[PDB]
Each structure stands twice: as C-alpha cells, then as structure tokens.
Design an enzyme around this catalytic site. Structure first.
Site, PDB file in Angstrom:
ATOM      1  N   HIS B  52     -13.889  -0.591 -19.388  1.00  0.00           N
ATOM      2  CA  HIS B  52     -14.562   0.135 -19.321  1.00  0.00           C
ATOM      3  C   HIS B  52     -14.370   0.981 -20.133  1.00  0.00           C
ATOM      4  O   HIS B  52     -14.188   0.269 -21.764  1.00  0.00           O
ATOM      5  CB  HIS B  52     -12.913   0.924 -18.576  1.00  0.00           C
ATOM      6  CG  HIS B  52     -12.588   1.009 -17.411  1.00  0.00           C
ATOM      7  ND1 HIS B  52     -12.030   2.296 -16.131  1.00  0.00           N
ATOM      8  CD2 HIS B  52     -13.196   0.710 -16.339  1.00  0.00           C
ATOM      9  CE1 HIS B  52     -12.314   1.631 -15.052  1.00  0.00           C
ATOM     10  NE2 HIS B  52     -13.291   0.812 -15.093  1.00  0.00           N
ATOM     11  N   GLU B  54     -13.603   3.760 -22.013  1.00  0.00           N
ATOM     12  CA  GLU B  54     -12.158   4.245 -22.486  1.00  0.00           C
ATOM     13  C   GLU B  54     -11.703   2.866 -23.042  1.00  0.00           C
ATOM     14  O   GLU B  54     -11.699   2.412 -24.910  1.00  0.00           O
ATOM     15  CB  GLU B  54     -11.262   5.149 -21.856  1.00  0.00           C
ATOM     16  CG  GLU B  54     -11.537   5.723 -21.739  1.00  0.00           C
ATOM     17  CD  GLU B  54     -11.907   5.489 -19.783  1.00  0.00           C
ATOM     18  OE1 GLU B  54     -13.164   4.768 -20.030  1.00  0.00           O
ATOM     19  OE2 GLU B  54     -12.155   7.171 -19.609  1.00  0.00           O
ATOM     20  N   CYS B  82      -8.635   6.201 -16.535  1.00  0.00           N
ATOM     21  CA  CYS B  82      -7.813   5.515 -14.733  1.00  0.00           C
ATOM     22  C   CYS B  82      -6.467   5.263 -15.795  1.00  0.00           C
ATOM     23  O   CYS B  82      -6.236   4.970 -16.210  1.00  0.00           O
ATOM     24  CB  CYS B  82      -8.666   4.526 -14.150  1.00  0.00           C
ATOM     25  SG  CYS B  82      -8.559   3.127 -15.083  1.00  0.00           S
ATOM     26  N   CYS B  85      -6.757   2.474 -17.822  1.00  0.00           N
ATOM     27  CA  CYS B  85      -7.435   3.582 -18.991  1.00  0.00           C
ATOM     28  C   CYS B  85      -6.253   3.999 -20.447  1.00  0.00           C
ATOM     29  O   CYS B  85      -6.020   4.076 -21.115  1.00  0.00           O
ATOM     30  CB  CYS B  85      -9.234   4.160 -19.282  1.00  0.00           C
ATOM     31  SG  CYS B  85     -10.496   3.004 -19.150  1.00  0.00           S
TER      32      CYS B  85
HETATM   33  C1  HD9 Z   1     -15.717   2.826 -17.147  1.00  0.00           C
HETATM   34  O1  HD9 Z   1     -15.239   3.955 -17.775  1.00  0.00           O
HETATM   35  C2  HD9 Z   1     -14.443   4.817 -16.336  1.00  0.00           C
HETATM   36  N1  HD9 Z   1     -13.520   5.442 -16.812  1.00  0.00           N
HETATM   37  C3  HD9 Z   1     -13.036   6.238 -15.716  1.00  0.00           C
HETATM   38  N2  HD9 Z   1     -12.017   7.249 -16.466  1.00  0.00           N
HETATM   39  N3  HD9 Z   1     -13.001   5.648 -14.572  1.00  0.00           N
HETATM   40  C4  HD9 Z   1     -13.793   4.809 -13.993  1.00  0.00           C
HETATM   41  C5  HD9 Z   1     -14.584   4.046 -14.792  1.00  0.00           C
HETATM   42  N4  HD9 Z   1     -15.208   3.644 -14.169  1.00  0.00           N
HETATM   43  C6  HD9 Z   1     -14.818   3.240 -12.941  1.00  0.00           C
HETATM   44  N5  HD9 Z   1     -14.265   4.225 -13.317  1.00  0.00           N
HETATM   45  C7  HD9 Z   1     -13.317   4.440 -11.574  1.00  0.00           C
HETATM   46  O2  HD9 Z   1     -13.201   6.268 -11.238  1.00  0.00           O
HETATM   47  C8  HD9 Z   1     -12.298   6.446 -10.720  1.00  0.00           C
HETATM   48  C9  HD9 Z   1     -11.528   7.327 -12.182  1.00  0.00           C
HETATM   49  O3  HD9 Z   1     -11.584   8.520 -12.603  1.00  0.00           O
HETATM   50  C10 HD9 Z   1     -11.469   5.159 -10.731  1.00  0.00           C
HETATM   51  O4  HD9 Z   1     -11.446   4.616  -9.229  1.00  0.00           O
HETATM   52  C11 HD9 Z   1     -12.221   4.253 -11.518  1.00  0.00           C
HETATM   53  O5  HD9 Z   1     -12.478   2.757 -11.185  1.00  0.00           O
HETATM   54 ZN    ZN Z   2     -10.475   3.342 -16.719  1.00  0.00          ZN
END
Ligand code: HD9
Ligand code: ZN
Ligand code: HD9
Ligand code: ZN
Lengths: 157, 157
Positions: B52, B54, B82, B85
């Site tokens: 991700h 973060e 999430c 993260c």
């Molecule tokens: C890669 O950087 C990301 N950053 C965040 N914050 N979220 C991500 C993400 N890639 C997918 N997601 C999905 O978004 C929702 C969280 O808000 C969840 O479903 C996550 O699995």
């Molecule tokens: Zn995440």
C-alpha cells in the site's frame, strides 16, 4: 496437518530470533498441504517495521504464485496476528488463519499492547468473516512457551 | 505546510494510476518540512497486496533514515489509511497523520469496506495516541476528487 504447520511456524520463530533477523515470530503459508512460504520476523534484518512474519510470508507467497490474492491458501502464525498483520491477511484474501499463542504471551515479555479488534470481534467498523482457528493442546502450549524461552536472545523493537 | 504535502500525496495517487503501478492512493512522509518519502500504491507493480501507499512510504522512509522508527516524522495519506496501514503507522511510531479523503470515498468506487477502528476512535483492543488530522476545505475536495477522476482508469484489487 494443522499441528505440522503451526510447529513449522514456531520453528521459524526460534530460527529468526536466533538469526538476529528479528523477534520470535513465525508464519507459514500453505496451498493444499504444499508450503508456499515459510518466514519469520525480518524487522531488524530489513530495517522495516512492517516486515512482520505474516507480512513477509504474504509477500513471499504472492511473489511465488504470481498473484496478489491467496484465496486458495491458509496461513499459520506462531503468535496471534497484530492489527497490521491481520489487515494484511484480510487484504491477501487468505481463506483460513491458524495461530498458536495469544497476543498476551508476547505482551508479557514487553511487546506492544497492540491487539487486532477485527480478530477478536470487538470492532465497530472493521469486520472479519475470515476462518480463524485458535490452536489448542500441545502445539498451543509450545507456541505460548516460545516467548518465555526466547526473552534473552533479542532486544525488543 | 499540510496542504502542500497532502497535494503531493494526491499527485502520487494520480501518478500511480497513470503508471499502472496500483490504485489511486499516495503517501508522503516528511521530517520538518523535508520529504523523506513520496510513494503510491504498488500492489500491481510488486504483486504485493501489502504494498500500500502508506506501507510503501514507511518502508522507503525507514530505508532512507536507516532506522525502524520514524518518531520525528509525519505522514500524509491521500485517503484514510486502512487497518493494515494504520497498524503499520502505529508500529513505525510516526508522530502525526494527516489524511485527505474519508474511506467512504474509496468505497464508493469499488474498494472494500475496510476501515480502521483505531483511527476513528472506536477501537477496543487497539488504541492510538497518534495525532490525526482529517483534511478540510480544498485539501478534502482534492482528495475526494481523486476517486471521481480515476474511476475505471485502473484495475481493482
Ligand atoms: C494503496 O493505498 C491504499 N490506501 C488506502 N488507505 N486504502 C487502500 C489502498 N489500496 C486499496 N485500498 C482500499 O481502500 C479502502 C481504505 O480506505 C480499503 O478497502 C483498502 O483495501
Ligand atoms: Zn492500507
Ligand atoms: C514479526 O511477526 C510478528 N507477529 C506478531 N503476531 N506480532 C509481532 C510481530 N512482530 C512484533 N509483534 C508485536 O507482537 C504483538 C502482536 O501479538 C504486537 O505487539 C506486535 O507489535
Ligand atoms: Zn504483525
């Protein structure tokens, strides 16, 4: 089979704390009785606080299988996954989780009071329908003793 | 201060979807107005569901600073981190989090309902003392617009 792979995860924890790779935690990812990844904490070796045993195993298994989802795979963790690692297991789409020791055993030797609400079913927002098995009996006892056994071989991070 | 780095995280999200590296998410880790890391989702690029924005930024900042803790640094996330993260942010000991868009904005375009209780203050077993700032005004507008602008320009995961 459950005992075999949890035992392998415990041995990974011991091997990693003895390598200096990091803390006494191990994780094994299995695909229909075939081991895809067998890892331990690499936080110290990698200078990576996300390099937990479960995260390292997920990374290795996904790279090996050429897919970002491990829905035909199960993960065996020597210790109950932390919030970060449980979130990683969720995102991995792993279909089953078996863990040996409760997080309290790691906390008892000074580790962070850092427990995943979604694993214990105590969240408002984060839910889990992942199949979760708390190991009992022999393997559970060994996995819980891991932390008292290895308190001297490493300094906490 | 905050708006520049949040906009850089949003720019990282746009660049990442343009490159096919992953989804529309960015993260910027700074140390006293000096960018230590600037990253976006690398899940598709790395075949790593943990890659991700973060987590990637935490990895790269820890590599750059040669240590596993970032207590003197702050993190700007284009979208609400999430559970995985947010757990990584807790473990990395980052001292401040500033995020732009609420998780509902990402959910509304096809991502999982996957929300961190500890960030929103509904955690029982996971408690954060981290200083958290939800962006308002122009930063919030930019971060929310990310998901309307990148709709069906990337593969979901
Ligand atoms: C890669 O950087 C990301 N950053 C965040 N914050 N979220 C991500 C993400 N890639 C997918 N997601 C999905 O978004 C929702 C969280 O808000 C969840 O479903 C996550 O699995
Ligand atoms: Zn995440
Ligand atoms: C490396 O693999 C790991 N696996 C698990 N499960 N935990 C780990 C860990 N590395 C550190 N920890 C800490 O142990 C508690 C979780 O029970 C929390 O405090 C964690 O920060
Ligand atoms: Zn963990």
């Amino acid at each position: 089979s459950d005992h075999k792979f949890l035992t392998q995860a415990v041995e990974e924890a011991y091997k990693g704390v003895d390598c200096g790779d990091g803390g006494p935690f191990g994780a094994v990812i299995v695909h229909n009785n075939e081991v895809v990844a067998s890892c331990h904490n690499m936080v110290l070796k990698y200078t990576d606080p996300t390099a937990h045993a479960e995260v390292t195993a997920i990374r290795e298994a996904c790279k090996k299988l050429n897919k970002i989802e491990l829905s035909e795979c199960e993960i065996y963790a020597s210790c109950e996954p932390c919030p970060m690692c449980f979130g990683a297991i969720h995102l991995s789409r792993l279909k089953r989780l078996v863990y040996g020791a409760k997080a309290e055993a790691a906390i008892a030797i000074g580790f962070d009071d850092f427990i995943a609400d979604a694993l214990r079913g105590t969240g408002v927002y984060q839910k889990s329908s992942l199949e979760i098995k708390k190991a009992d009996g022999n393997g559970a006892a060994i996995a819980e003793q891991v932390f008292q056994n290895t308190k001297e071989k490493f300094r906490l991070y």
